[PDB]
């Protein structure tokens, strides 16, 4: 009848897409990169330890100047740190103790936060006198805020645990666009270098590529076997890396529209919470649930080093725009800056 | 480098005030206890709130100590992600309507949810205070010919009331037997893999006025004492 035909058509389309993807699999990255000299061994030491948070930290974000950074903890605090001198530039108390994400504006005049209140709060840091106060409260999501990234000082893209993403205009306070299509909570998002596209990973073992202007999904990637927690673009914007609860990382290309490389090992049976790239994209840094961080050769898929200085879950990880240092946060309420 | 010295000094006395304020706030943070109120709409979860928008706040004072209760609302029924945010609360209050023993199977769903919460890897240290609401409705349904307990729990007919059971006066053995069977269903899961790091505290509540906050206070005191006794290789 009317039903049971759409399902068969969808299955046929899935088979056609799979065949088209298979027809493009000329070779593999490992075969091509056989002549590449190995990276070797990466030995990083903790250059700074930042203390002052009372509860576990979920989020951090570097500044464009590669010197200041914001961190969010469920003690009810956003702390803005100077990395070079380990001082404290700002301390902002939050109306809701439950915060899951934080962002830092590229200009540096604003920060953003959100969590188990379905509201994104924007904080102005360049007031003429007084202190930091809420300038905008974007509301309308029906689920907890998972991630938020700034586009200029008037636009922001947020992901929510209501299976939808949103693009908001800050001045009016109304969301310009809604991105639908995921069947699970959207856990992370990453902006392209040109800020024209972005990618999101959901709790359905899938990732999607969205165009900001049109508001529609262009490509979908399904290689993982469990929930996706982290996602990050390659420096040139033609690829991206994802991490999940199945304990593997995967590199997906956009032109080829399929997976290129997998980063996993037999002795790792814990999920991956954070993903980041190096300045040149040669090293891929991943935070794990076993209280450790790993460094992978992004072209040869062999582990190159371990960041082992945290006593609890590693929740957030970030690399500066200069590429000099890597900052990691954990559930033990300390930040660590490595070089 | 005079300007550099001046700005560095300004940074130092800007950090000093922030650190002083953080030291002041640390005492307030350490001196209050966070409770996670869970359950379902059918199970009540609001009459508890009555006698003390994505989350709701409640605050109450017991013997001059602070308690904060967190009601999770306006959230989807996928709790496998946002539950991890409540892994350092002192207690999870789990409210279950034991009268609805006849989705149409509330007790089995509650048992499965309790098992999932108990066996979570990030909730291995969190204790649960179990409230079994609507006992009068359960008594009325058991006394009347509404439904049979062993239609969903066939092992009930082989259950004998434990000797330690102390029912409230003016009762019938059937309602006591049903209540203790339901309670032991949760106690089995609690005792299967507790390993001494956390416990479960089951209570029977019908209409008690301001006694629920007293029960929560006593159970939190017990939780803290047991944690202190365990860390000293003494319990």
């Amino acid at each position, epitope marked *: 009848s009317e039903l049971d035909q759409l399902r068969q058509e969808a299955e046929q389309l899935k088979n056609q897409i799979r065949d088209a993807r298979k027809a493009c699999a000329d070779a593999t990255l490992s075969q091509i990169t056989n002549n590449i000299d190995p990276v070797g061994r990466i030995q990083m030491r903790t250059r700074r330890t930042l203390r002052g948070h009372l509860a576990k930290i979920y989020a951090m974000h570097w500044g464009t100047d590669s010197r200041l950074l914001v961190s969010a903890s469920q003690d009810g605090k956003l702390i803005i740190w100077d990395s070079y001198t380990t001082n404290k530039v700002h301390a902002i108390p939050l109306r809701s103790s439950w915060v899951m994400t934080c962002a830092y504006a590229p200009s540096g005049n604003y920060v953003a936060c959100g969590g188990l209140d379905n509201i994104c709060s924007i904080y102005n840091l360049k007031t003429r006198e007084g202190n930091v106060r809420v300038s905008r409260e974007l509301a309308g999501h029906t689920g907890y805020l998972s991630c938020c990234r700034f586009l200029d000082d008037n636009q922001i893209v947020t992901s929510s645990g209501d299976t939808t993403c949103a693009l908001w205009d800050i001045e009016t306070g109304q969301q310009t666009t809604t991105f639908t299509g995921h069947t699970g909570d959207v856990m992370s998002l990453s902006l392209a270098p040109d800020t024209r596209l972005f990618v999101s990973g959901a*709790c359905d073992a899938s990732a999607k590529l969205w165009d900001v202007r049109e508001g529609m999904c262009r490509q979908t990637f399904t290689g993982h076997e469990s929930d996706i927690n982290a996602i990050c673009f390659f420096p040139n914007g033609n690829a991206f890396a994802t991490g999940s609860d199945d304990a593997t990382c995967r590199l997906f290309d956009l032109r080829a529209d399929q997976e290129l490389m997998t980063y996993s090992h037999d002795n790792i049976i814990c999920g991956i919470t954070s993903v980041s790239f190096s300045k040149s994209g040669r090293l891929l840094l991943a935070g794990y649930d076993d209280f450790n961080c790993n460094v992978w050769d992004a072209l040869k898929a062999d582990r190159a080093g371990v960041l082992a200085g945290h006593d609890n879950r590693v929740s957030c990880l970030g690399v500066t725009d200069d590429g000099m240092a890597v900052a990691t946060g954990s559930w033990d309420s300390f930040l660590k800056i490595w070089n | 480098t005079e300007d550099q010295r001046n700005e560095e000094k300004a940074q130092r006395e800007a950090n000093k005030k922030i650190e002083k304020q953080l030291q002041k706030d640390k005492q307030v943070y350490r001196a209050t206890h966070r409770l996670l109120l869970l359950g379902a709409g059918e199970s009540g979860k609001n009459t508890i709130v009555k006698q003390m928008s994505g989350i709701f706040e409640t605050k109450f004072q017991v013997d001059k100590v602070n308690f904060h209760m967190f009601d999770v609302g306006a959230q989807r029924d996928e*709790r496998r992600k946002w539950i991890q945010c409540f892994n350092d609360v002192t207690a999870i209050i789990f409210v279950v309507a034991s009268s609805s023993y006849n*989705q149409t*199977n509330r007790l089995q769903a509650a048992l499965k949810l309790f098992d999932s*919460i108990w066996n*979570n890897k990030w909730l291995r240290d969190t204790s649960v205070i179990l409230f079994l609401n609507k006992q009068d409705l359960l008594a009325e349904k058991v006394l009347a010919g509404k439904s049979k307990i062993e*239609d969903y729990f066939p092992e009930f007919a082989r259950y004998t009331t434990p000797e330690d059971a102390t029912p409230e006066p003016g009762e019938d053995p059937r309602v006591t037997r049903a209540k203790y069977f339901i309670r032991d269903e949760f106690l089995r899961i609690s005792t299967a893999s507790g390993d001494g790091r956390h416990y479960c505290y089951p209570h029977f509540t019908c209409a008690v006025d301001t006694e629920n906050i007293r029960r929560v206070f006593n159970d939190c005191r017990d939780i803290i004492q047991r944690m202190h006794l365990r860390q000293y290789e003494l319990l």
Partner: nanobody
Amino acid sequence: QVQLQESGGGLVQPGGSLRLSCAASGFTFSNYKMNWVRQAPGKGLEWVSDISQSGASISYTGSVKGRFTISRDNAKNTLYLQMNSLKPEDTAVYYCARCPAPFTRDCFDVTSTTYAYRGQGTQVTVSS
């Protein structure tokens, strides 16, 4: 792409038997604990049974103990449910649900209205 395809079902006289098969692809079958869930007409999802990675632990609800049986073949990546004695209250759509994550002792969201790692389901009716 994780795929769970259910088989079996149909119309069966009271007292009859049915064998339901769940073919799983796209993930490592050995590392996950599997569940059989069902939804009756005009009702919600009900957990029916579950089995662990190696089959050591098996659980049922009180309305199916003694009658229903669950098993898994890890070599062929298949989940089997055998229904020996059937009743008019067993008319429902049966789904084959999967644990959200591997190597975990818990399963949070398998009877939810929406859930990613669940199959289409098969209709089973026992009327006359």
